[model samples]
Target chain A: MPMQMFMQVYDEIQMFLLEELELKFDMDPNRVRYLRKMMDTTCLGGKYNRGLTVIDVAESLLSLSGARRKRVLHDACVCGWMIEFLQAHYLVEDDIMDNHPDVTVQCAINDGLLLKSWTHMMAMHFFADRPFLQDLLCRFNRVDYTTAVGQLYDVTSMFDSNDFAEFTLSNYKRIVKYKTAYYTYLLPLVMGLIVSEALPTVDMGVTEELAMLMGEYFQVQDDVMDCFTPPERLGKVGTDIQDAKCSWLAVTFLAKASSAQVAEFKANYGSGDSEKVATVRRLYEEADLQGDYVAYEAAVAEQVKELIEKLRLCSPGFAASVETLWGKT
Target chain B: MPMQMFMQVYDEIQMFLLEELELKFDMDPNRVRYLRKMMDTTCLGGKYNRGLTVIDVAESLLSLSGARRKRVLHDACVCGWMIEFLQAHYLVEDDIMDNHPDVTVQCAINDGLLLKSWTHMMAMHFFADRPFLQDLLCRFNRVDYTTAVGQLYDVTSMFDSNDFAEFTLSNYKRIVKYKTAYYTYLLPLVMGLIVSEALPTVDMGVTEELAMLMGEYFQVQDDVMDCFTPPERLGKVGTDIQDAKCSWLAVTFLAKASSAQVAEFKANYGSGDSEKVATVRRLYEEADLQGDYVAYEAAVAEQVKELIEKLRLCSPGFAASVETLWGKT
Candidate 1:
């Protein structure tokens, strides 16, 4: 039902964009067509959860199924789509900047175009005298800025091999908080709350804590999946090892390995050779990263459960809205 | 005095960024350091005329010469620096997407960071209860979207050479209006007017007409300089021919060439070989492009002067602010 709602929102945003592009760029049909194609690929290709949560939360708060609900859903969908747009922009930029082998000029243009469109969409949707809209805009900006800073750290840490050596578990946590937590979890939750006018009533600190826990858990799962998932099942060959990503397993290896084990990792971890990948996999096994991941997973699950219970106490309906996210992981 | 004032604005913006970055990103001094370095190179390397014009117009509108003026100048400087930041983002994206031979990963990251920073700066400076600020922000977003669309046309037209040939003078005019004119001339003027509360009093139609004339003149000059300016003076070899740029001269050639000349032009244009370059240059010379540029210059100058006279009647001080731009051409 959430996904169906998300698709409906997607269609609505798509129509809005079509009219906006046509009006603003009547002379350039080619650009409008290209942008439309890109919007479909980048914005709609992702799992709709991030965007859907906005509506879910709004529904939970209002519990109304009438004209007011329709108006709220419309605005919330715009906000939801904006989150998707922002993610698309970040991913396109990240892929290109990380020098992904298949990255193309079109990806860069799509990134730029998305960056322009995110704010454009926001402006068009909120074209009114709502004072709090400015604060919402500022919140959006701050989150984006935080993500960029986190990305800068991720990039520089990769390049500065010296810093990479110093990239402790603590640093990794900070990086994920900046890169993943802010946008993936916090942005959707905040936007939903803002849309629902429930922001003032909710305990923001507790909400943020819950979101961050979800984000961290999601990323750990991703890193684990990168190594553990079969290539056939995953639909792509995992390159995190070859990419020298500061992944959860890498951080775990650092925490658990002896000096000799660390030296072995330093030599073979990021190599492109299959033999090198096997060596790193063996190293991870010896370090018992899988065990650590299982334990970490359990801990995060408990923590999120506790936070959800607290959220339930605050607003039982809102707790149900967030349960969908926990169900996914 | 204006240039001196411009440098002060640049310094102010640099300081503001340094403090903002330091406060928010104190955990990663290295990133902050690198960002500061990037801000200097990209934001300050330009001629600063676009940024300066904002201050020039602001000063023209308000003659306050004390603490109040200082505060206004600071805000205007922030606005000016934002313009520079937006330009830098475009250039980084443009360079990479165009596959400039020297473009690298850092350029992509810089583009991302700049995109993030632009709105962050806006949120900080315009944090008060000003309803018009939202409209101003929307105007900013619209202009940027128009520019990106223009850039898309510029990029796509070059690749779709069929469209490039169909890239009549009218299409080129539209592209430049979107890409160069809106952001370069119109945005700064409008922002300055908004800052000074002069937007209501000034004839925006006349002001826009003058800015468009100036913008058109500047771009034509840029295209002419690409071909005519010596490599040493220009600091880069002209690659418009080899790169298949839809330059003014190329459009002019399309308009004026004989059938035999057109065949020759088609074969040799956009070739990297020195002989091909020489052939295109010879063709351009035969077409009297340089002579046409001179004639066009005179026509644009006459039109700009007439528009400035009209603007002077509406706002004499604003007219004075604009004279500096005409002098540059």
Candidate 2:
């Protein structure tokens, strides 16, 4: 929200991307026109928390120099957009992975593949001459694998397998850590730090440990918010319960509930019947999970703040800004 | 097949890839073991024509040093395997793109995403210290975009849209060029040339033209073979007619048939009934398209040979080797 120059970065990416599709591949106008529409539909959405996170970190560390401000912000915005494009790429795939009921799997798959392609195209177009490009490429590649493994675990372990025997907090944590955490908290965080060259100044073990904690904290908050947050305030109407997803709330509720209580909860959890759906939520409230989640959220913030103090280049404000992100609707 | 040390390269890639997944990501044995199973199922098959094409080109260009003998084959085989992995990545998607009925869309999408991540991992693992690494990354990125565009065009244009309004030879050629040409023929060709540093020595325009010719020629032959080849021989049972695919034969058959005849052809074209399928193939045979295809195949081979003649470092055997690829099963 602060320095909002994203639209400029995207417009520039499209400007060069379209021309290169022509110049590099001799792609014709009609085809380029088709791609233009697809990009707008697929790449251009969401709250752009990830993109803004990049800019936020840049603003903090970068304040890189007052004299070099013009170029540094420009390059950092490009880095942020790259991370956003990666997010865009995965979002396209996850829709299909989510059994996207409304669209063609064929076109979505095509759309998904091309989004990553566009990400890579922008990668080379902007960073081919830069020294950080190789590390950036490797970093992006690493994120790609980590996220996919998380997705794999999610599907292979979660619903329709229908055995809830492994829904322990440990398994749930791994799923959250891999599926949501790495990409959500770590990738953009690392992207910003790497671009600012502050990554070297911080301990990566400390860096990863901090991110894993945030990653788990963020998704856990997401699980709580999904069930508790109103559609009017936080949105998505929250499907984790209906979808029989592996969420922190579900994992916790199962651990605490009695045998008789769990039978009722399990039967109601994903039935899609409105009465049963209410039963699942009603049980969670009976367990006083909202109050529990509030306590957990505050504890996570305290833990995150303590860890932030260990890094000299990163500040208490970095923790504060992330808290703002976590706390905001 | 001549110097088949490919198993060694793939073994080396797996060796490094598995270790890095452990060392870099601190991945658990369970996850790494799951990947090994998926890799064996998906990446380990196929005729590896594209893979061998890299080795073929490497042999033609690199013969790089006998003293480096221990390493040159080691490295070039890695390049070939990289192309093979990219093929594996797209193949995973295309099964879904092709509406593959035997698999889960969820698992396939996960498989597709991971295969690409694996490709990038091997890319950095081997090439990070090399000078051509940037170019290699860019080259693979370009292929990703080009192939995805081709796929987009194929889905948007081909069946289920059910309109053959644009199935002209020109459109068919673009579909073939984009969807099939760049990755199938040009990528491995360019990769091998790149590894040998022979890419700079050759004219890319000339190289691309030669590859494009071979690409179109290859698919057309595939179309013809699908219809004409025995189930025991060329395999795949030839779904194009039944699937209402936009093949060279279909496009050509559309062009040559009278409107009265066309009505009969279109009526039977994609119906899955046994009688309708027979009628479609019977029509093509009745038209003596087999004779026409034989003549077309011979002429394409001749044209490709001429293009091959223009390059200095390239030999006539390059054409002959491609001829062997073209003509063989």
Candidate 3:
């Protein structure tokens, strides 16, 4: 349908520039043109399966017309794409911060277009076009705010020792909620829900609890893969250790480490050694937290299953999303 | 009247911990209770005055009913606060990537609450309430995305050693637009217009040109102050030299830095040596860019004066905002 236009080709080019090949040229026409190339890249890549999550919900609640449904789908994708862009925005800065060569599938910044990301972001304001877009735009802002804020916490926690003083299991959970859960899971899904017009009320609480628990587990899996997965598959070599990140692994390790072990790891780990990644992984396993996580994952899977059963009582649209997400496991 | 609830003296301890001190400690009886506090503390304080700028434009258009005014003020504050928080969010991580100390605000994260500022960004989402909030939120996100994306270009440009390359004028200005302008000048007032429903149109081209130019001069003044201002007034001492930040000074310096001078600066300027700040300052004088900023500042000021005169034709709101801002110089 003409209602849904595809910009996947343009998105692919922009993605190539933003993710695969970092493009940091100066203000020559080439760079400006590259930026415009990115700016034009939006709402493409049809089938619209990605946006169905929001539309189904909106349609069910709003009794939205076909045009509205298309609009909902378009808005959802823009939000989804922008979320990825926001994440990449952080990743580019992060790689520079971590001095990493690659993030997932690509270099953190382009050979020439390092500062161009700023222009890309500033320029992105032009793209927030959708019905009732002001609200969506605000939510977009909130998501960005949450993600960046989470990152601030994430980066500082990596470098400092005293940060771990209050680093209980509860604190780790809280940090993940801040650092990953909101942007990664809650914001995307909630944005879908918003677009669907079937905005889940916070007072009706079961849905959020289930989503959050699952989201944390999802982050846990991603963290685990950072250690165990292949680099090509993982998109980057090394694990959270390379970033000196105070990640689940680090937090778990610290929880188990003896005073001497803690000092040794702190002093030696971020010294850019492959040996450090191994040492930390060994420490994590030794702490038995690796086993704990396995148990935790199993428990969460059961809860998700139960939540799926329960979601049917509330709405089929959200329930279906749960099943699909669960199926991914 | 009930909505304008006074800061409850009853919750004095909680208020002190969360509000006055801006601690990230979660001692609230309710987990989300301190969310609003987080927004105000970390996001609202900065020299850029984005939150206030937004208010300036909005207030001129609509004489808000008392209840509506309070809600909008809070909304404006949160939006402004979000922008500032975004900056802190950017700085907390950027300082680590840049590997600097001033973000501790002169103390070390050893104080435990140092992570307070970093973590506070995550908590900002809890404060999302009020009418027109979504637009405020979107502008906040847009500026953040713009700034962070802008940083990539900056980091890449710094590494570019092509002599007198377009990196000088083009790359530097691009950085300022993204890193310096987006949040500082553009988003704040733009957001105000959005929430107040006072924007001439969503296009709002009226503000974009003039405000952005104001942003450029603001940055130039800041760069000048890095050399000329004292630490207590400016917060961190020698921010530009300390961070190896590519200010207009550096951009102008690129024109004159010889092979030996460039080599010496590339090696020495980024180092934490106490003397490098002084040495770089000497180079600025030698290069005559200090004089250039003084000239540039005046040129920008003249343009700003002319722009403000043009703004008077737009609306009383627009002219009022322009005049208030102009008075700052």
Candidate 4:
């Protein structure tokens, strides 16, 4: 009974956000207009990528009974929202940090002034306060914090110009795994499966191992997109080079660069020079980062196929959402 | 058993913060150490002004047994930390908006640079995640949102510039009562009494009414300190003027001043100008704000005395902690 209503509501809102209210949430003429804009812009326009994973998984475990069907629907929607919420929180912090203004044509900061951003935070508080919502919200919080702590480490571990010790590929991969993978790819799928009663508690070990592997592949694709995708297509220009982001590009560079090349790259990449960005691009070319990414994609495709086979045999009742991720990359 | 251990660990940490830290609360470093420092600072540094209220209330209830004592202790401390946490959240956000460098004694931003102040937003998330801590945390969140909403009005309610109609005494009182008083004075005491088993729930009509009254007076005293107290004694000076914060001073000025004088004060008071600040100070003195504060303090003293007496007669069980606040003008 309840789940039936939930699916109907979730689909309706999802369509409104993903399709109808694309530019409107940001244009509301009120004091907290920026807050609504931030909420919708960050939560809605994320390629509709993470939300679908939960829905796809739930579909595989469809229940015939009305009550059980409702539970599956609720689990799917809430899990989807949790991923979107985590992304919004991250984007809010990232926007403030990077000083990027527009997200899919919505201004991140209203003329570089803020109206406290208090309402956005308050809206989230109310969202979490709903019945049986606290647990779901807490799981989201853990994943969100895990990302933040990872970001902290990412910020502090910028490469040294002279020493060249901090930017190791191993260190870079660790950061990607923590900051991008867990919350982005694994959390929603695992949470949805558990909520749908498809995932058994005893299978946590299998879940975590699979989550980490798939999460790594998910982040690597994101890294590849950040370097090459068009601003119009991706909604913003690449900032990884200019922002000195600790990404796979940098990790590959650290692993492959000559000493003098490392010194040159550090001097120019983190500074405010377009020429520096160009020089680093040439270095990336030499490092064959684009080719490396293509190779990694192939390897991940093969490994994920094997992992899926292993996962099915290992946890027969585990979330069907697991299958949705296979085609994501 | 696990919850009791968690409570004990929290109390031991709080004891160190209160007795050793003296409310300084890592402000000598940076406010944006995020959750770890906020956790330590808020838990440790309160005057136990809020906490002692709960213990006092509970002592009056059924005679203490071992487990019951621990449970009550858990409730009081959680409630107290909830207040401190919310206060820290508000103050951090307030500091960032005002470009305030120091809160109690240190930089509000980390390393003298504007780091993302989204950690203030994360404080509520931290509270929501605490296991079995939801009931207490939710009540704190409800009041916290009330405080934030009040601050919202306070921030954007600058329509008056000098118009008393827009900055009425009623509005001034409401701002302080909602934004500051509820979280500080009423919440700590009410939560304490409710948990200590001094009261069955926090919804006692007479008791709550009295606590809120006390909070109103407490805010009035704070306003007096904001305007009249010595700079060293007051800790930080001129925050109201620097930030153009709308306080009771502005309300009284608007109500009492001529149109020309009101315009003059509005132009000068919020200009971040020392001369203008001095001019506003002279006008406040001319209005005899010190006299108004003194009269208000006297009125509150009378009310508190009456409320304590009424509680002693009407419900002796609730009167244990009521005595401490009785004549504490």
Candidate 5:
């Protein structure tokens, strides 16, 4: 009920872009219609936590009760969805490749840009007068570049041979740190800090490491959930094993798996054959990934707690915002 | 002759991004190598008159010889290549869909955003103090939207049934006007005006119509050249027919040809069969596109000159920049 206002703002600007595209800019009706459906798929499919946390953090940064508070929160919620829009760009880009019509691929590419463009346009309109306008934009640009490089690392690994040696945890952390943490955990908090007029007083160095530690904690849970969660509970079929996604469970298993175990897992993994998937799943059970994940989660959670206290030394208020609005355990 | 300095800046930034991606950002060697090559393919293959005109128009705005003149020209040329970077985003998007590797599609999409990001970054750095910064960025964003929809028009035409009826001249004009005119003709001139500080005084309504009409003329020539010009002269093989592209020559022939001519043309056009392409080529020769283009050229050239005179009434300097650079014969 608290960050509920974020979805209301999402629908407003979502309609705003659609209306402008159709009646104002006068694009093809068919393109507009296709874009309408994609807007929901790309923007609305997320659990709304990232957008929600932005609102939560911004709310706590409110200095006093006045018209200023009302005005500040409204603008804060607007940039809240802007962070979601930025994340939606990565989600949309990650999955789009081939099939449908020829224009399907191109249209999605253009729409991805259009969705992110609105974030910038909305920022320009909303924050045009903010003293820190340039700094706010620079934050998003850095994230975009860093995330793209992370994706390059993730994608190129697909072409390499199916050796367990290639799945090192060190490289996996680099991929997740750039690909996930910077945008997911770091960007929203930065947006909140900027919007609340607190960025001038806050220290970001500790906030960044804290966010990255939290992201590792979050993605490890995600990777484990993909492998272990049932479809009924998960709300989607997990494809990490078949899609050959780099996963902490697999990398952890691979580290301790015997030579024969490594050979068999490599053979069965990424095959996309149904029986082979069952073989990989059987191996994960034998290796006890559930227990491995429990221990890993405990260790990273402690790290998250440790860094949050470090941030508390310099920015006490934001430390609690992290516990409440970093939006994950 | 005056805009000869433009390409020198192009090479500098081209390498600058490559270096940043490789050593500074530390992305994959393979991705960076592929991108280094694509940098040339996407950004360098253009005739570069669009980049040149921006510098040319920006040059004429200088009041006199001074240190300010030198610095303005350098920054003007920087944004000149930025326009080229923007066009590269369109050109790269237009052709990309399939083949190579699967991530190939995704990498190109990310790099396209990266390329355009530099334009914004360069603008932010170079024009941070400029009074018209917001207006300038808004202009680019508007063009990006228009050109994308123009592409939607161009691509969707590929799927329509082979009726010459769908390819009317009105729609043809619309496609060319939005696709080519806005970025190719209008954008560079507007860039020149904005950089020169002449935008406040120049009459854009006249400039818009003049640029649109000239784009129609320019594209008619391009479409005709795709059909009529030899490969040696053109420096590229024309594939408009084989690829089922929408073309003014095909549309023009469809308009006035007899029923028998219409049937024969539709069968061979876009068929991609060598003999059929020869048949379509035969029809164009029979229809005398050369003679028609001459009259069309005469009419549109008069329109361009007349509008330049109309603009001359308000801003005579930009009018001369137009004659020199609205950059065509």
Candidate 6:
């Protein structure tokens, strides 16, 4: 049911965005083509559940299952899609920026141009004559700026010769909190709260608390998937080991690593060869990382459950909405 | 007088910007270093006349002297510096996008990061409670988006083997208006109007009309200087010839060239050799581009004078601010 409704919202938002682009750039055919293509792929692609949370939360608040629900969900969907669009832009450009060794100047300009599109789309949807509009724009601006700071920390901390020593657990948490927590976990739910009028109507402190916890849980899952998921299932090979990512696994491995084992990791980690990748995987197994990951997940699950119960005290509908995102990983 | 005052305002804005950056990223030393350096060079390294206009227009409207003028200019200065920061981000990234054939991915991510800084600065200064904040944010969004579209047109129409065919006069005008006019001429004045509380007080229609015309005139001077100014005078070597820019000179050359001359130009234009550069210069001389530039300057002067006169009828102080921008070429 969520998937079906999510796709419908996606289609509606895409339709509205394309129409707006056409009105804005009717004279420039190529720009229209480029922008249209960017919107279609970057905004729509991905697991898209983060975006779906907007609708899910909105639905929980309203409890109506018909025309009015659909209308409100449409607005929530626009906000949802905005988060995805922002994420897609960051991910696409950040991948090139952090990992792509041979990014061109054109590539750089394209990244800027893509960001412009994100802001433009945001203005089109959210630039409204209301009090909460200011709050919305402020949140968007803060999250983006915070995320960029996080990104800078991430890029500097990335797998590089002599950069690995700085990849501490605390540093990783800071990066995840800024880069992932604000945008991925909190942004969608915040949009949902806004669309549902729950922000002004209910105690959002509980929601914020829950979203932040969920953010850490989501990132832990991401690290797990990066290491354990097969390329065939994920549709892309996991390169976190080779790329020297500051993942939860990296912190876990370091915590358990012996001095000789650490030496082995330094040699094998971030090496492009399949043999080295296999060695890193074997090291993770030897350290019982899988057991560590399961324990972490259990801890996060308990945390999320506790927060949801607190949220239930605030608003049962909001609590149920938070619950939908619980088992995503 | 302008230089002395501009530097005073520049120092003020820079101090504020650095202080904000320090507060935001105190935890990340590397990020703080990177962001501070980006803010310093990008915001300060230009003629900055456009930015100064914000203070100029505000000063004209307010007629404040000494302490009052200085304080008002400080606020106008923040707006002005925001314009410069936005321009620097665009120009730096755009130059690479258009010119760098084998740009690296690091370069691209750097572009996105630079933009994040721009938004961060805007939030620092302008994130306040006011009725018109929405309008200010929307305008900022619109101008940036329009400028990017212009950038796309300019890039796509650059001097290449086949790209020249699209460099029509109408297209050139579109590129200049979008890329230069709004950001360079209109944005600062608009900011001034906003900070001075002149938005509700003045007739913005006349201001917009004159600023737009001034924007075009400003760019024509830029095109003329790019071809005619010495490296010593301009502070950089002109790459318009090799870059195959759709310059004012290029359009003038096309308008007057015979079939054979056109063929010669097509062969020699945008070539990398110094010899080819010389050939293009010779062709410009042969076409009496110097005379053409003078005539264009005169025409633009007439148009600006006429508009300023019209503007004076509405707001004498605003007209004086507009007049200070004229006669640069």
Per-residue lDDT of B1-329 in model 3, one digit per residue for the tens? 21122122113223433453234423223223433444345433456455466556566656521776765554454444445545655554443433322324212111212232322332234334445444444455445555655665555454431222544666667777876676777776776766676655433565667667877887778888887688888776666676566678877886778989877666656556668777877777888887788788888888878776666664655677667865764
lDDT of each: 0.74, 0.74, 0.55, 0.56, 0.76, 0.71
Candidate 6 residue lDDT tens string, A1-329? 77777677666666665566567644455555565665665666578887888888888889831775766777786677777777777776654444311124454356446554665455456435445666676677777777776765665575331157777888888778777787888888888887776776656777766666777777887787888899899777788887777888888898889999999988988777889889999999999998988898788788878878876775788777778887674
The CAPRI class of candidate 1 is acceptable
| lDDT by residue (tens digit), candidate 1, A101-131 | 1125644664556654655565466534444
Q: Give the clashing residue pairs of candidate 6, or none.
A: A103-B103, A103-B104, A103-B105, A104-B103, A104-B104, A105-B103, A108-B108
Residues A198-296, candidate 4: write the lDDT tens digits.
545336655666676777777777777877777898777777777666777887777778999988887877644778878888888888889889898
lDDT of 2 by residue, B171-200 (tens): 788888989989888887788777766666
Best by DockQ: 2
Q: In candidate 5, residue A260 scores what lDDT?
A: 100
**What ordering of candidates by TM-score runs from best to worst?**
1, 2, 6, 5, 4, 3
Q: Which 10-residue span in candidate 1 chain A carries the lowest summed lDDT?
A: A98-107
* lDDT string, candidate 5, B125-192, tens digits: 66778876667777876776677667667766766311454587887887887677898888988888
TM-score (all chains, Cα) for each model = 0.93, 0.89, 0.61, 0.75, 0.86, 0.88
Complex DockQ per candidate: 0.39, 0.46, 0.10, 0.12, 0.33, 0.33
Candidate 1 residues lying further than 4 Å off, grouped into runs, are: A98-107, A115-119, A126-131, A161-163, B1-12, B64-67, B98-107, B115-119, B122-132, B161-163
lDDT tens string, model 2, A179-200? 8777777787777776666666
Q: Compared with the true structure, what per-residue lDDT tens digits does model 4 show for residues B250-317?
A: 77677778878877887786656678888888888888878877887787778877776666665765
lDDT at A171, model 1: 71
The C-alpha stretches of model 3 lying farther than 4 A from their native spots are A1-80, A86-206, A213-300, B1-83, B90-94, B100-131, B145-162, B167-178, B186-197, B201-209, B216-300, B313-321
**Docking quality band of candidate 5, CAPRI definitions:** acceptable
iRMSD per prediction, in order: 5.9, 5.8, 9.9, 11.2, 5.3, 6.6
A1-329 in candidate 3: lDDT tens per residue? 22233244235435544542244423444445554443443223333333343333344444421686666655555555555545544444443433331111122333212332332342244344534455554555445544444544554554331235544557666667666666665665677676665664322366666656777788778777887778898877754666565566677777678998898677655545767667777777677876877987898888878876676675665666656655644
Model 4, global lDDT: 0.56
Best prediction by TM-score: 1
TM value for model 5 = 0.86
